Design an enzyme around this catalytic site. Sequence first.
Site, PDB file in Angstrom:
ATOM      1  N   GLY A   1       0.816  -1.197   0.000  1.00  0.00           N
ATOM      2  CA  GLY A   1       0.000   0.000   0.000  1.00  0.00           C
ATOM      3  C   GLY A   1       0.854   1.252   0.000  1.00  0.00           C
TER       4      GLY A   1
ATOM      5  CG  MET B   1       0.308   5.268   4.969  1.00  0.00           C
ATOM      6  SD  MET B   1       1.681   6.381   5.309  1.00  0.00           S
ATOM      7  CE  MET B   1       2.477   5.584   6.717  1.00  0.00           C
TER       8      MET B   1
ATOM      9  CG  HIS C   1      -6.321  13.622   3.000  1.00  0.00           C
ATOM     10  ND1 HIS C   1      -6.982  14.339   3.966  1.00  0.00           N
ATOM     11  CD2 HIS C   1      -5.229  13.097   3.596  1.00  0.00           C
ATOM     12  CE1 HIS C   1      -6.309  14.275   5.094  1.00  0.00           C
ATOM     13  NE2 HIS C   1      -5.247  13.515   4.899  1.00  0.00           N
TER      14      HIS C   1
ATOM     15  CE  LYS D   1      -8.429  10.711   4.734  1.00  0.00           C
ATOM     16  NZ  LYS D   1      -8.042   9.460   5.451  1.00  0.00           N
TER      17      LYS D   1
HETATM   18  N1  NAD Z   1      -2.795   7.747  11.003  1.00  0.00           N
HETATM   19  C1  NAD Z   1      -2.119   8.279   9.968  1.00  0.00           C
HETATM   20  O1  NAD Z   1      -1.229   9.082  10.178  1.00  0.00           O
HETATM   21  C2  NAD Z   1      -2.358   7.842   8.553  1.00  0.00           C
HETATM   22  C3  NAD Z   1      -1.528   8.243   7.503  1.00  0.00           C
HETATM   23  C4  NAD Z   1      -1.785   7.765   6.225  1.00  0.00           C
HETATM   24  C5  NAD Z   1      -2.845   6.890   6.028  1.00  0.00           C
HETATM   25  N2  NAD Z   1      -3.634   6.526   7.052  1.00  0.00           N
HETATM   26  C6  NAD Z   1      -4.731   5.576   6.897  1.00  0.00           C
HETATM   27  O2  NAD Z   1      -4.099   4.308   6.708  1.00  0.00           O
HETATM   28  C7  NAD Z   1      -4.864   3.488   5.836  1.00  0.00           C
HETATM   29  C8  NAD Z   1      -4.037   3.010   4.643  1.00  0.00           C
HETATM   30  O3  NAD Z   1      -4.058   4.007   3.645  1.00  0.00           O
HETATM   31  P1  NAD Z   1      -3.241   3.882   2.291  1.00  0.00           P
HETATM   32  O4  NAD Z   1      -3.394   5.235   1.669  1.00  0.00           O
HETATM   33  O5  NAD Z   1      -1.904   3.254   2.551  1.00  0.00           O
HETATM   34  O6  NAD Z   1      -4.166   2.842   1.508  1.00  0.00           O
HETATM   35  P2  NAD Z   1      -3.732   1.832   0.348  1.00  0.00           P
HETATM   36  O7  NAD Z   1      -5.051   1.264  -0.137  1.00  0.00           O
HETATM   37  O8  NAD Z   1      -2.784   2.441  -0.646  1.00  0.00           O
HETATM   38  O9  NAD Z   1      -2.917   0.690   1.131  1.00  0.00           O
HETATM   39  C9  NAD Z   1      -3.557  -0.168   2.070  1.00  0.00           C
HETATM   40  C10 NAD Z   1      -3.106  -1.582   1.785  1.00  0.00           C
HETATM   41  O10 NAD Z   1      -3.699  -2.450   2.744  1.00  0.00           O
HETATM   42  C11 NAD Z   1      -3.856  -3.660   2.042  1.00  0.00           C
HETATM   43  N3  NAD Z   1      -4.797  -4.540   2.710  1.00  0.00           N
HETATM   44  C12 NAD Z   1      -6.113  -4.334   2.869  1.00  0.00           C
HETATM   45  N4  NAD Z   1      -6.666  -5.374   3.512  1.00  0.00           N
HETATM   46  C13 NAD Z   1      -5.682  -6.240   3.756  1.00  0.00           C
HETATM   47  C14 NAD Z   1      -5.573  -7.544   4.407  1.00  0.00           C
HETATM   48  N5  NAD Z   1      -6.677  -8.109   4.921  1.00  0.00           N
HETATM   49  N6  NAD Z   1      -4.364  -8.138   4.466  1.00  0.00           N
HETATM   50  C15 NAD Z   1      -3.262  -7.567   3.953  1.00  0.00           C
HETATM   51  N7  NAD Z   1      -3.287  -6.371   3.340  1.00  0.00           N
HETATM   52  C16 NAD Z   1      -4.448  -5.688   3.224  1.00  0.00           C
HETATM   53  C17 NAD Z   1      -4.397  -3.272   0.676  1.00  0.00           C
HETATM   54  O11 NAD Z   1      -4.320  -4.344  -0.270  1.00  0.00           O
HETATM   55  C18 NAD Z   1      -3.519  -2.080   0.392  1.00  0.00           C
HETATM   56  O12 NAD Z   1      -2.373  -2.459  -0.368  1.00  0.00           O
HETATM   57  C19 NAD Z   1      -6.078   4.343   5.502  1.00  0.00           C
HETATM   58  O13 NAD Z   1      -7.090   4.001   6.446  1.00  0.00           O
HETATM   59  C20 NAD Z   1      -5.662   5.774   5.726  1.00  0.00           C
HETATM   60  O14 NAD Z   1      -6.748   6.633   6.092  1.00  0.00           O
HETATM   61  C21 NAD Z   1      -3.391   6.960   8.280  1.00  0.00           C
HETATM   62  O1  7FN Z   2      -3.707   8.897   3.261  1.00  0.00           O
HETATM   63  C1  7FN Z   2      -4.642   8.992   4.075  1.00  0.00           C
HETATM   64  O2  7FN Z   2      -5.732   8.477   3.760  1.00  0.00           O
HETATM   65  C2  7FN Z   2      -4.544   9.635   5.262  1.00  0.00           C
HETATM   66  C3  7FN Z   2      -3.546  10.349   5.812  1.00  0.00           C
HETATM   67  C4  7FN Z   2      -3.963  10.795   7.018  1.00  0.00           C
HETATM   68  C5  7FN Z   2      -5.216  10.349   7.192  1.00  0.00           C
HETATM   69  C6  7FN Z   2      -6.068  10.533   8.224  1.00  0.00           C
HETATM   70  O3  7FN Z   2      -5.797  11.287   9.191  1.00  0.00           O
HETATM   71  O4  7FN Z   2      -7.201   9.978   8.183  1.00  0.00           O
HETATM   72  O5  7FN Z   2      -5.560   9.648   6.120  1.00  0.00           O
END
Ligand code: NAD
Ligand code: 7FN
Lengths: 269, 268, 269, 269
Positions: B12, B14, B156, B160
Amino acid sequence: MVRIAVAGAAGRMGRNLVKAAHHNPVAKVAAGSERPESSLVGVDLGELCGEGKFDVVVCDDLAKQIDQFDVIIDFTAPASTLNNLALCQQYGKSIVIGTTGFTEEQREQIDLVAQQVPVVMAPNYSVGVNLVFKLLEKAAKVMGDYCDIEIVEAHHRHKVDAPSGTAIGMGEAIAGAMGNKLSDVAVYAREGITGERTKDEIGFATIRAGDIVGEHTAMFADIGERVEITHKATDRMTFANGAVKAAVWLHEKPAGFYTMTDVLGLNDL
Amino acid sequence: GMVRIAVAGAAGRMGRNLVKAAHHNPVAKVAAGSERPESSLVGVDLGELCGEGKFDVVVCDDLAKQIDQFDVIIDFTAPASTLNNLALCQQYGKSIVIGTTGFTEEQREQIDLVAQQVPVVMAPNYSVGVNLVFKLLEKAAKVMGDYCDIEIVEAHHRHKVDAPSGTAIGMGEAIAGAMGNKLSDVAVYAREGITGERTKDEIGFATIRAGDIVGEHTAMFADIGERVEITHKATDRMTFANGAVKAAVWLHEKPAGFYTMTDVLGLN
Amino acid sequence: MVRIAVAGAAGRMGRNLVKAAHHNPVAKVAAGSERPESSLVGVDLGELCGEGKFDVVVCDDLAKQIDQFDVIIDFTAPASTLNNLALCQQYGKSIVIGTTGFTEEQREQIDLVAQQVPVVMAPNYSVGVNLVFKLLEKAAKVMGDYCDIEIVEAHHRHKVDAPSGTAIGMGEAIAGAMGNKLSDVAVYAREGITGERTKDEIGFATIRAGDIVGEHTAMFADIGERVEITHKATDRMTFANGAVKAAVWLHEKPAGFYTMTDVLGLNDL
Amino acid sequence: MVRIAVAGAAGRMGRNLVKAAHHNPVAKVAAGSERPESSLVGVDLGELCGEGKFDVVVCDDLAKQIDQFDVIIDFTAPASTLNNLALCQQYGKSIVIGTTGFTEEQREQIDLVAQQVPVVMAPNYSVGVNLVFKLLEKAAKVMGDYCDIEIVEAHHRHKVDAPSGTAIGMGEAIAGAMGNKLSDVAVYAREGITGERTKDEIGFATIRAGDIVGEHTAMFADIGERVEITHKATDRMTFANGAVKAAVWLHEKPAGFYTMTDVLGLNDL
Ligand SMILES: NC(=O)c1ccc[n+]([C@@H]2O[C@H](COP(=O)([O-])OP(=O)(O)OC[C@H]3O[C@@H](n4cnc5c(N)ncnc54)[C@H](O)[C@@H]3O)[C@@H](O)[C@H]2O)c1
Ligand SMILES: O=C(O)c1ccc(C(=O)O)o1
Ligand SMILES: NC(=O)c1ccc[n+]([C@@H]2O[C@H](COP(=O)([O-])OP(=O)(O)OC[C@H]3O[C@@H](n4cnc5c(N)ncnc54)[C@H](O)[C@@H]3O)[C@@H](O)[C@H]2O)c1
Ligand SMILES: NC(=O)c1ccc[n+]([C@@H]2O[C@H](COP(=O)([O-])OP(=O)(O)OC[C@H]3O[C@@H](n4cnc5c(N)ncnc54)[C@H](O)[C@@H]3O)[C@@H](O)[C@H]2O)c1
Ligand SMILES: NC(=O)c1ccc[n+]([C@@H]2O[C@H](COP(=O)([O-])OP(=O)(O)OC[C@H]3O[C@@H](n4cnc5c(N)ncnc54)[C@H](O)[C@@H]3O)[C@@H](O)[C@H]2O)c1
Ligand SMILES: O=C(O)c1ccc(C(=O)O)o1
Ligand SMILES: O=C(O)c1ccc(C(=O)O)o1
Ligand code: NA
Ligand code: NA
Ligand code: NA
Ligand code: NA
């Protein structure tokens, strides 16, 4: 009850001050001044701010009205302000200073007289800015040591000094919170080939345009993220009410150099 | 000393950054990574995924198969998946750093419950700047909140799936909390048609979804005559990733509990 | 010199119009009206906008002051405006219409009268906003097909409608330039799990706070870059200045239906 | 296929260019250069941009690799770029120039060589910026005569020249659309007592911080309103892809001075 003298009563700020002091029920507008050359000498203060007749007229010298007032509120020009400060020392008066564009030498003088005279000096009289100064301190302690620090400001086309006093105040708050002197780190201009940014410099950028009452942003920038703290002023009455409030506050006090942080009780935030 | 890290959803946005971040943190080892069973990236070297050589660790479709390989899971995936990993942690004595957002209230309750038996870090944002901003919001709310209109705006990228962001909600909670209020009593998440004049206490949320924006957040405190805006802009996901790895290293020592980045950074 | 009659001179817009016409050096404030019921009838126009005594008083019927003016600027209510339009037809006058909320029937009547009378009618009179609409068309033609389009606006705490009429106007200009209807693509709220953004949606975000007069931003976002076009209103006077500009322009123009595009020469760009 | 030589291939832009040229299926990466001092001389280009091994190595002089390439893409430093331009003149090659911080004299020299060499030169290779230049022309025609014009830009801590070439390009577009020369009106710094703003000046403000890839805002400010046109660059690949596209376009063109506006077909927007 505070009797107020408004220096440079015909100015943008001066007119707002007369009005602010008039409507503050703890303050009286007792005197006002203008440049000796100025035609508005002998005009009623109330007529000047468009609110009836106060029975107080504009003078070319506040020394002539010494028995009428307790505190001077001064948003004029640095030389003029220094005269008023001298006047305060001599006749046992107090002063709220709003004027900006003082040299470092002149600020040293102000500090000196402030040991004998009660003085409020701030580059900004709004609550929001004084809050922002405290927020900057905290941001500087956490992010300052490893981040680039830049200050940007915008003001209207009539402003004669750059950068603004508020922007400098922001720099001082930041530098001070990091155990530094602003003048050691400040960069006020960038033209041509400047080379790579130094690690410690605090950069200042200045915009002059239209009727902008005042915008300020402080940026703390890392590789990968940045934090920006911004203040926007919409009305000069904000500044005016704040300065009248400082004058009311100052009337009860001994000699000293005071800021709006003191007036507003923000020191421990 | 050494914390062995499992990265959930390693392919993903992240996840890739997390692999890289854990690699670069000298107190951490990248030991495992997961992806959806469907995913074509199953069996791929984790190092190839983040473009940093070959780690000799490959992506699996289930972290249960790699239980012996790791101590802490870092999970930025999707809520169902994260709950599954949380269960895995309970069963096998592991720890978890949760980044995933978009949990329902019911799901957050479950997380709190498991956090009583499992060491858990959960934060809306893992960057230093944002955690700083939360503290600044508290101060701003104490001085200006009772007299000013409070609005939160965030932007964003187009991928998202949840609105508003977890970070925006965290900002609202920090503000509301500092004013002795519950966010859900005051929050307004949408404005369409005739809404009437603004209520004094409401905290408004506006959401922008566009392009590749990594994350922008602004909190505005607006009076008659002036306004204060506190803004955070994220340029690189490595900001988040480094912070989450730092949380994982920190969490490895620790007993069961629900922890935030405030606990990790000692920013309270 | 264009002699201007301000309909509904005691209104929010009306007061600003008197002031704007006074300030424009190619325009004279010659007349003003109010509802016959109004207590402001017989008041000096200048006293009304706080601009001193103009020697022109508010009347309940512009037909009584027909010899005093060439052009009417009308930001009132549709019935009243239609009456003024009729007056223009009868006495050989011109009109700038700012009033909105006409039915389709009423607009047909306006078009009919516009065959004999010189008429400017527009939904926005601010030069900046009209310019921005044109810029949005251009940006949409170059970037719209492959970019995400978002509109963000901020207004003061008293605005009851969201999103603003201007933000919608921006969406329409964009959509229209891309051969689309706004209502096919617009998304006005985002709460909870919304899924990934669609390719063609135009998103609206709305901020309500403080005393903000009006900010509007349109964003065109790609992977790797974005373009933002913004308008900020600082004072409601800006709309008034645009309408006075239209009146100056309309003077001595022949009969026809004209827009702010015609006034500003926006096709000849 | 266009064979591309990347000058200063280890640079921020250079590494992106190698990568961009590799991924463009109409282009190939045939050569790359670095400073003779550089420790990266003899390194594989592919390894440099982290894309496997290309079987092409960095040299200290592009004259040695003349037979390997058709077009040079040059984002280095002005002296170096002029040397490459000379090389093009001698050996019948073409060049895409990205380098900024040229003096007016150096730009005159570039124009001269461009009469016998095919040259693309722009301060910015993104679509968004080139769009923005056209929008600025339009905004300047409508608002420029009576409004204050200010340009603000932000870049990362490593940028050596201020203001940016892009900010200058914005100023030139604006000035040019108003029948003016930028250097007659530009103000690049404001420090101390500057006096009131002039009517015609175009102010530049510069921010240097962090990893900011590039932000630019042009403001047109009146009393009562303002218009802001902004561009934000998120990734250097935007610039790099644009330059590789210009190189592909330039290949087989005759001698001439070309901009990105020519490459993108934006001249009659
Ligand atoms: N707290 C923070 O600072 C912060 C920062 C960035 C993103 N986020 C959050 O983190 C999450 C990830 O976002 P992203 O932009 O990386 O999404 P993304 O879709 O690019 O990556 C997420 C990955 O998780 C994988 N995944 C999903 N279900 C799975 C499972 N059961 N087993 C293994 N892998 C699985 C997907 O296949 C995908 O590759 C989102 O909820 C986003 O809002 C939070
Ligand atoms: O990439 C994202 O989705 C992302 C980055 C930060 C947050 C959040 O605070 O929900 O979500
Ligand atoms: N601290 C703050 O919060 C704050 C807020 C706004 C402005 N300012 C500063 O206050 C100052 C005033 O700005 P402004 O826009 O009102 O200026 P202005 O030009 O509108 O007014 C200044 C007035 O002072 C008068 N003056 C000058 N010399 C004088 C003298 N010797 N005696 C009497 N009057 C004299 C001038 O005639 C003029 O009317 C500036 O320095 C500005 O930077 C400070
Ligand atoms: N196109 C634009 O740019 C723009 C901007 C703002 C408002 N408007 C429109 O302009 C109109 C007025 O807006 P406003 O905010 O000034 O409203 P307002 O209610 O403040 O003012 C309207 C005025 O019209 C007067 N009026 C009504 N009927 C009259 C009559 N027969 N004779 C004389 N006076 C009469 C009222 O007494 C009042 O003073 C509305 O229709 C509104 O939608 C247009
Ligand atoms: N037009 C645009 O779109 C655009 C975009 C980004 C940067 N730029 C400009 O491009 C230039 C490059 O900036 P950067 O951030 O990549 O700088 P950088 O310092 O990271 O890269 C410059 C590289 O050129 C190399 N170089 C210098 N002299 C050389 C020579 N004689 N032979 C071979 N190599 C040489 C340096 O060693 C370095 O590797 C700057 O002028 C910047 O303003 C333009
Ligand atoms: O901080 C300042 O210097 C400041 C605040 C307001 C003004 C002004 O209008 O000149 O200047
Ligand atoms: O417009 C410019 O000058 C510009 C664009 C990009 C950079 C840089 O990275 O230095 O400089
Ligand atoms: Na009073
Ligand atoms: Na590591
Ligand atoms: Na290729
Ligand atoms: Na000229």
